[PDB]
Design an enzyme around this catalytic site. Structure first.
Site, PDB file in Angstrom:
ATOM      1  CG  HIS A   1      -0.453   0.291   2.505  1.00  0.00           C
ATOM      2  ND1 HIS A   1      -0.355  -0.690   3.469  1.00  0.00           N
ATOM      3  CD2 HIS A   1      -0.098   1.447   3.111  1.00  0.00           C
ATOM      4  CE1 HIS A   1       0.094  -0.158   4.595  1.00  0.00           C
ATOM      5  NE2 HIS A   1       0.274   1.135   4.400  1.00  0.00           N
TER       6      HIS A   1
ATOM      7  CB  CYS B   1       2.906   0.417   7.359  1.00  0.00           C
ATOM      8  SG  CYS B   1       1.197   0.421   7.941  1.00  0.00           S
TER       9      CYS B   1
ATOM     10  N   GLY C   1       2.954   5.668  10.214  1.00  0.00           N
ATOM     11  CA  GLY C   1       4.278   5.436   9.685  1.00  0.00           C
ATOM     12  C   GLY C   1       4.943   4.167  10.174  1.00  0.00           C
TER      13      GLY C   1
HETATM   14  C1  LIG Z   1       1.018   2.209   7.997  1.00  0.00           C
HETATM   15  O1  LIG Z   1       0.939   2.684   6.646  1.00  0.00           O
HETATM   16  C2  LIG Z   1      -0.327   2.523   8.656  1.00  0.00           C
HETATM   17  C3  LIG Z   1      -0.345   2.055  10.170  1.00  0.00           C
HETATM   18  C4  LIG Z   1      -1.630   2.421  10.916  1.00  0.00           C
HETATM   19  C5  LIG Z   1      -1.760   3.942  11.130  1.00  0.00           C
HETATM   20  C6  LIG Z   1      -2.151   4.158  12.597  1.00  0.00           C
HETATM   21  N1  LIG Z   1      -1.890   2.874  13.262  1.00  0.00           N
HETATM   22  C7  LIG Z   1      -1.597   1.891  12.330  1.00  0.00           C
HETATM   23  O2  LIG Z   1      -1.344   0.722  12.653  1.00  0.00           O
HETATM   24  N2  LIG Z   1      -1.418   1.822   7.938  1.00  0.00           N
HETATM   25  C8  LIG Z   1      -2.642   2.359   7.601  1.00  0.00           C
HETATM   26  O3  LIG Z   1      -2.895   3.555   7.874  1.00  0.00           O
HETATM   27  C9  LIG Z   1      -3.734   1.524   6.863  1.00  0.00           C
HETATM   28  C10 LIG Z   1      -3.566   1.716   5.344  1.00  0.00           C
HETATM   29  C11 LIG Z   1      -4.501   0.871   4.463  1.00  0.00           C
HETATM   30  C12 LIG Z   1      -4.242   1.060   2.944  1.00  0.00           C
HETATM   31  C13 LIG Z   1      -4.415  -0.605   4.831  1.00  0.00           C
HETATM   32  N3  LIG Z   1      -5.100   1.937   7.310  1.00  0.00           N
HETATM   33  C14 LIG Z   1      -5.422   2.075   8.639  1.00  0.00           C
HETATM   34  O4  LIG Z   1      -4.717   1.593   9.536  1.00  0.00           O
HETATM   35  O5  LIG Z   1      -6.544   2.771   9.002  1.00  0.00           O
HETATM   36  C15 LIG Z   1      -6.773   3.078  10.372  1.00  0.00           C
HETATM   37  C16 LIG Z   1      -8.311   3.314  10.704  1.00  0.00           C
HETATM   38  C17 LIG Z   1      -8.379   3.477  12.208  1.00  0.00           C
HETATM   39  C18 LIG Z   1      -9.105   2.073  10.229  1.00  0.00           C
HETATM   40  O6  LIG Z   1      -8.833   4.459   9.982  1.00  0.00           O
HETATM   41  C19 LIG Z   1     -10.079   4.465   9.327  1.00  0.00           C
HETATM   42  C20 LIG Z   1     -10.159   4.330   7.929  1.00  0.00           C
HETATM   43  C21 LIG Z   1     -11.380   4.321   7.249  1.00  0.00           C
HETATM   44  C22 LIG Z   1     -12.549   4.440   7.995  1.00  0.00           C
HETATM   45  F1  LIG Z   1     -13.739   4.432   7.349  1.00  0.00           F
HETATM   46  C23 LIG Z   1     -12.528   4.571   9.379  1.00  0.00           C
HETATM   47  C24 LIG Z   1     -11.290   4.581  10.028  1.00  0.00           C
END
Ligand SMILES: *[C@@H](O)[C@H](C[C@@H]1CCNC1=O)NC(=O)[C@H](CC(C)C)NC(=O)OCC(C)(C)Oc1ccc(F)cc1
Lengths: 300, 298
Positions: free
Chosen positions: B39, B143, B141
């Site tokens: 991603h 990931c 960050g």
């Molecule tokens: C690394 O790129 C990052 C790590 C996350 C950020 C905060 N804590 C973590 O572990 N990954 C992401 O942000 C990931 C990216 C996707 C393409 C898989 N998405 C994610 O972790 O979303 C967090 C969430 C709390 C689910 O945010 C929301 C997204 C969409 C919604 F409708 C509601 C919440």
């Protein structure tokens, strides 16, 4: 929240083993010096009341076996500084990090790299208790394992392990060889002072709860520092120092809750209990996360 | 008794930073390949339903900036394996440890090296939950941070971090890029299945509490394996298998407490509670120590 250790690699690159006779413990190799507990020169018979100075005069450089792995490091000088031995070696450790030696206060946390025979086995976070013990996981052969914090590129070494007390808790020195607390490196009868709760860390924990939106315990009142300290002692909490007030500064600024207002909230919790409520999903107040630990986790 | 992570130095020497456009995360540099979450190639508008094969075909080697410290590594090739991107670089990592890629089972534990911008920040022990989440500490960050176990000289990589769920738990893949659990690397709110408690681990931790002289929860009763498991299921504890009983043998021998006797003590704790008491400091039954973890630390 969880105990999070510092990455250990910069310290792993400094661990060696030091043997005298059949006694092997760990040492810390920085530049061209190896630091280790002076009781490596003791036989079992010397441990009850060793004359360290007399025991050391009988030693020569060639009596000390220092090894990084299976590779011997030649010793070219030796001296004692309080309860640590310093062995000058003929090779500067190429993995020496930027480092300093610090003496920490009770309540401060640090990472321990538990080592046996110069080989690291695990890393975990420890808090120095107000009675100057730690709750380590230390087996035979762990002496000379060190505790540290890392800031930017810099390793601050704060602890070297020397002994276990009858109650299962652990005691040691700073890297200048001065014991934390009233302990001595003799295999004699020693007990820790009664322990107390680390107030500054509980306050840090309450600040963390507020940051995460859990703030039912905040009240409309304040206290003086002296009035709070006199109450806290009646509940086996440590009194706060000016340094404690200062290191809560950043969390106070982040939340807008003055330190002494949080003290008044804590005082009410002590006097009235939780009344069946939780904070951060716990009816127990946590005291092993420092203000820096809380910032380290909440904000990154 | 202390949660203890493996020393992280062998993994620290593999962490790099990977950037695509405005997206930066961590990668794992082994020999001449950098592994990272795919991603990284997504933008804001991509996250919702990313057609990763389409997004990737539109990228060149030069769209990927890899930095090992202050040094840029030239990408000379890329491919995708499930949810992981593999970037071939022109330099081999001399700090590559002996390693393998493993897929861990629920209930197993591992160490996490949390990293930001290619720099290690902290290390801690995690368990793979039965519902295939992990209760981590991961921020923006993080990931590409990895989880691992170390056996002698060999690093077994089992986890790469991809996402946080609304409940605050975490989800990710093995190093072949297959998620643990029913999760997908799209920017949506995703729920996990109902979690359960890892029974064999709770038993291991009770044995740990006994070893350290804490035995107020013990009793004289016993139980059959099937009757214990009926009570466990009722309390959303995982079943205890005969393999688990066997695995717990060494701890049973050391303390002289039969496994099924300890099962009887746990049953009592489930039905009655801890009545304010604590075990090894905890008001709650701890289930992220394996039998091996308890032994290794005893
Ligand atoms: C690394 O790129 C990052 C790590 C996350 C950020 C905060 N804590 C973590 O572990 N990954 C992401 O942000 C990931 C990216 C996707 C393409 C898989 N998405 C994610 O972790 O979303 C967090 C969430 C709390 C689910 O945010 C929301 C997204 C969409 C919604 F409708 C509601 C919440």
């Amino acid at each position: 929240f969880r105990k999070m250790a510092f990455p250990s690699g910069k310290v792993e690159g400094c661990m060696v083993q030091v043997t005298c006779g059949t006694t092997t413990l760990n040492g810390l190799w920085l530049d061209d010096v190896v630091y280790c507990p002076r009781h490596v020169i003791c036989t079992s018979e010397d441990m009850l009341n060793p004359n360290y100075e007399d025991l050391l005069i009988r030693k020569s450089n060639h009596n000390f076996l220092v090894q990084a792995g299976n590779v011997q490091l030649r010793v070219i000088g030796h001296s004692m500084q309080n309860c640590v031995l310093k062995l000058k070696v003929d090779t500067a450790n190429p993995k020496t990090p930027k480092y300093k030696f610090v003496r920490i206060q009770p309540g401060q946390t640090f990472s321990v790299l538990a080592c046996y025979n110069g080989s690291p086995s695990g890393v975990y976070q420890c808090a120095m208790r107000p009675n100057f013990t730690i709750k380590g996981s230390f087996l035979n052969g762990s002496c000379g394992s060190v505790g540290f914090n890392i800031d930017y590129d810099c390793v601050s070494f704060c602890y070297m392990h020397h002994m276990e007390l009858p109650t299962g808790v652990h005691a040691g020195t700073d890297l200048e060889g001065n014991f934390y607390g009233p302990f001595v490196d003799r295999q004699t009868a020693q007990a820790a002072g009664t322990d107390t709760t680390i107030t500054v860390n509980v306050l840090a924990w309450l600040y963390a709860a507020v940051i995460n939106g859990d703030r039912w315990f905040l009240n409309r009142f304040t206290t003086t520092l002296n009035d709070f300290n006199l109450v806290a002692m009646k509940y086996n909490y440590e009194p706060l120092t000016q340094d404690h007030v200062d290191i809560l500064g950043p969390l106070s600024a982040q939340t807008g809750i003055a330190v002494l207002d949080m003290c008044a909230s804590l005082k009410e919790l002590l006097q009235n209990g939780m009344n069946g409520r939780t904070i951060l999903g716990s009816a127990l107040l946590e005291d092993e996360f420092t203000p820096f630990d809380v910032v380290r986790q909440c904000s990154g």
